[PDB]
Amino acid sequence: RFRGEHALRRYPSGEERCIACKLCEAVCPAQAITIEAEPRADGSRRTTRYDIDMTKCIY
Amino acid sequence: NTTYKNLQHHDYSTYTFLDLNLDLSKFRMPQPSSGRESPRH
Amino acid sequence: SNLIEVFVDGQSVMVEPGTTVLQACEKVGMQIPRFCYHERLSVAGNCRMCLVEIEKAPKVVAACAMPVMKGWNILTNSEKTKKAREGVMEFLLANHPLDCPICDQGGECDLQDQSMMFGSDRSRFLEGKRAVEDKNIGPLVKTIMTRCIQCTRCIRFASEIAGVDDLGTTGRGNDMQVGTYIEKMFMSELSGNIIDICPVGALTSKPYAFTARPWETRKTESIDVMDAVG
Amino acid sequence: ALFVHRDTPKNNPETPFDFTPENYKRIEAIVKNYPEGHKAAAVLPVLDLAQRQNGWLPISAMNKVAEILQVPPMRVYEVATFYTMYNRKPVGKYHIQVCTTTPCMLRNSDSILEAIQKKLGIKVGETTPDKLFTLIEVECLGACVNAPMVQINDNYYEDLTPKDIEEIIDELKAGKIPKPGPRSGRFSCEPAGGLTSLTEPPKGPGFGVQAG
Amino acid sequence: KTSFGSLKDEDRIFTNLYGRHDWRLKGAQSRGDWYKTKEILLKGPDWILGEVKTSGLRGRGGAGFPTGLKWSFMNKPSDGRPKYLVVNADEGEPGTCKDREIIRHDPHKLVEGCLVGGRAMGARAAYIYIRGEFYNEASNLQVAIREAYEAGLIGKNACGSGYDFDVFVVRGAGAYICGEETALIESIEGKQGKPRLKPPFPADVGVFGCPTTVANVETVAVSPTICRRGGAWFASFGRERNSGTKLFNISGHVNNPCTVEEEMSVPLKELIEKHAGGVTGGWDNLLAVIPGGSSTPLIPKSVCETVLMDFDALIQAQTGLGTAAVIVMDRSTDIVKAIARLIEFYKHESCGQCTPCREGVDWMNKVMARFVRGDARPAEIDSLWEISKQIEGHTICALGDGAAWPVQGLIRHFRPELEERMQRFAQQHQ
Amino acid sequence: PLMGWASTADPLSNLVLTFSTKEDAIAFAEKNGWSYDVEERKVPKPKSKSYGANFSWNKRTRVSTK
Ligand SMILES: Cc1cc2nc3c(=O)[nH]c(=O)nc-3n(C[C@H](O)[C@H](O)[C@H](O)COP(=O)(O)O)c2cc1C
Ligand code: SF4
Ligand code: SF4
Ligand code: SF4
Ligand code: SF4
Ligand code: FES
Ligand code: FES
């Protein structure tokens, strides 16, 4: 359960796993997460920008 | 008695209710109006 | 001088005749939780969340549409008031899908706030959860009718203010769709106001749809243009 | 069960639908039953008249009822989708409804269902590969003192058994509609044995009247 | 005090229940209808209200409010709006068969009762809401109303009085809650059939807004004989509070199932055996007996060895007596399957205003399906008890309470059979 | 210009001072020095709604859909 170098997962044989639901931006105690969301042409809600500062991140 | 006194309703067709409703048109109270002819006048 | 005494939680207050129980509880400052009462529309008794106990009475009455008799004494924090609220809340979250991440009213829902501050903690209802095919009300209003709680507040709003008469309940039992039967684009004035009326994330905004989240955007007072009313 | 219209070009207005002027005279009488100023209350009998003038009702019929009774159409769509007479999908000439809830089921209803099923072939909900035998099961029709019961169009059948099912279906195939009374004795709701209820003739006028 | 008795003929309220006698206005006049009715119309509504409150006519239809107090609620001082009488002739509550028989065989007694009820409160018109599934009997009622108007009997100068009065027949469209007290009133108005809230009672806001009242066909049909026969003679049948004659409809697993008229107070074993054959396989073969119909919890055998058929006695047995549907179920029948099909009935016929009955009937139907298959553990049957507590008493109408009662009666009385079913499925699946 | 954030030259912008009356608000704003615009508190109007008038006879408050 070691914590460090976080990265985004994706579905088994599929697309990105994130939703841009902004739960992680709401809970981030350093306020390091920056999310900007747009839906693509398919209609599923997605992102544009998901930026993390590793400098601010207390892990 | 042992003889069933219906079978008056044996030969009721489809439109008999509305035909009797048409036959009972006259001798009826004059349906009191209330301001407008409809809730949207 | 047209005064009636109501003891809200024991505390006395004078109230004009004809008003509801909920207006008296808001006259003392209480909020009885509610889903289908709205202070600009006609009162219907559909949602049943608004229940409150009157002392020396067997039944639990609906505070949205109850007039005031002489000398009440109203318990807003009694036993069966809380039991009725937790019960109605446990019914409402059954046929309501798991969409709180992808939903658009995720910060500003009412099921979430009232299921925090009034409802139960553990759930039940192992099997079930109906799903309803969504409609297309308009190209300005995104419509996911799976999240609908059938509170019938879009219909009362359309019929009594927009004057259009296009939205209708259809069906019985669990199968009560709320929408247009004839695939017709509900296109009229004040069609945008229906997204603030619908308290759950069913009738949501189309251009706003998946672009924000309401705990981040800060609020600012401002005045309209392009209309003489402002 | 398809509570969205989904144009389906046998529907999809305008489908040609019109009333006989004798039916206009009917609708005049039905609207004159109700008090003036509340003309919107005749939607249910006028829409029933449309159902019996055209065996299943299209969307042009609902629009025409809304035009005659000057109501918005959406209220007519609510009333047509709410009730159970107004079969919006097209049905056949005859329309079998097997009524089963508790006492119908508690007196061996499933044998009647399988007898209909193997005399006709097609299952519930759908229809035969022609018209006139749309089969559905239904909830209580109100004759619970008899068998699981058979409703054909505006006609009951009570106190049945699968051989009488075969008789009724073959005579409907012949076209000669049978008598709508119950079968196998007790022509109405009677104790079928000795008839231990009232036997003496009634007393007529003035039997113990007081301050009339 | 006659010790709870049994009925004897010449005191039945209405004969010709089987169609054996001539049905016409001539036949009704031979049987004894429309006799001295002008002196009933010309005596005053104080007399009719005093007679009905004196006789103690307990109201029928499943509610059980006393009829005299309701008709006295209809004595508002007269405003510029008229008053209506709505005769409710629906049969839901599967087991009923109650006033289908009256409305087919003797409609002239219904016209008796509606004229006396219209005079009783200054009413102006009587809307008779018949079930949509009763088309032949609706045509028979139209023939009766036609002959009533054609003999100059009612209409303008009703029975020679100076009191106009008319009767209209509204066919329904097929529902069960249109049989209620107020969704009936919205079904007349041309809306969809859904109930209203209670703080406007029908004595203040009713059919389009006029103060109306709703009455069952048994109460209406007994209402002329209360006036034309003796004062409080109707309360010489049974106990004192709940008194008179009632139809009893014995369907199900009895030999020759039928309908009878009897006293209100009557023992259940004598009711079942001595008028409708016997229980198939002797008296010991029966498993349970539900009185009332679908809005009443069940009665096991050891309770129904003694308990008579009265409102207060069945409330002391913790079962609210509905209307006359005294049906049985056999030892060799899955009572769980029968009650689960009854819950499927409530799912098919219920509107969806209230979130409690809608969501609760959803859960109770899925849970009763799983208990027919036996696919749970006893914490689920306790949770079924919890939801059947939470539905009852939080709705508009009494269909939610009626969906909560038989589930409660099943959990009260047939607990170990559910335990055995779930044990069988566990031993087979494991 | 490296990530697309919202940089600002504003220390005082992220403040909020929740008070309980207008008088103490004006007193604090005049005490601590800066300018102030005091807006108005606009209560909801006490209406009178009635289900019985939602089901009236001759009036135009006939909902026709419930
Ligand atoms: C679910 C339900 C079913 C009802 N079924 C009937 C019915 O079959 N017949 C009837 O006249 N009233 C029926 N009612 C209405 C009430 O019984 C109503 O009180 C009755 O018409 C008059 O009551 P009373 O005889 O006590 O005056 C029903 C009510 C509900 C809630
Ligand atoms: S926004 Fe954050 S919390 Fe939400 S799905 Fe994406 S990574 Fe997970
Ligand atoms: S409407 Fe409310 S409860 Fe439903 S998914 Fe959206 S946030 Fe969740
Ligand atoms: S769409 Fe929204 S406003 Fe309309 S009934 Fe459903 S939850 Fe209520
Ligand atoms: S309890 Fe159910 S059937 Fe009764 S009014 Fe409410 S939604 Fe309709
Ligand atoms: S607010 Fe009273 S029922 Fe919804
Ligand atoms: S259940 Fe079949 S007739 Fe009542």
Numbering used by the authors:
A (entry chain S8): 60 to 118
B (entry chain V3): 35 to 75
C (entry chain S1): 6 to 235
D (entry chain V2): 5 to 216
E (entry chain V1): 9 to 438
F (entry chain S4): 68 to 133
Sentences from the paper on this structure:
The ETC is composed of four large membrane protein complexes: (1) a H+-pumping NADH-coenzyme Q (CoQ; ubiquinone) oxidoreductase (complex [C]I), (2) a succinate-CoQ oxidoreductase (CII), (3) an obligatorily dimeric H+-pumping CoQH2 (reduced CoQ; ubiquinol)-cytochrome c (cyt c) oxidoreductase (CIII2; cytochrome bc1 complex), and (4) a H+-pumping cyt c oxidase (CIV) responsible for O2 reduction. CI is an ∼1 MDa membrane protein complex with 45 protein subunits arranged into two “arms”: a peripheral arm that extends into the mitochondrial matrix and a membrane arm that is embedded in the IMM (Hirst, 2013, Sazanov, 2015). In mammalian heart mitochondria, the majority of CI is found in association with CIII2 and CIV (SC I+III2+IV; respirasome) or in association with CIII2 alone (SC I+III2). Here, we report the isolation of functional SC I+III2 from ovine heart mitochondria.
Because of the hinge-like motions between the different regions of the SC, we carried out focused refinements on distinct sub-regions to generate higher quality density maps. These focused refinements were performed on the peripheral arm of CI, on the membrane arm of CI and on CIII2, resulting in reconstructions at 3.8–3.9 Å resolution and improved atomic models for each region of the SC. CI appeared more stable within the SC than previous preparations of isolated ovine CI (Fiedorczuk et al., 2016), allowing us to improve the model in some peripheral areas that were previously disordered.
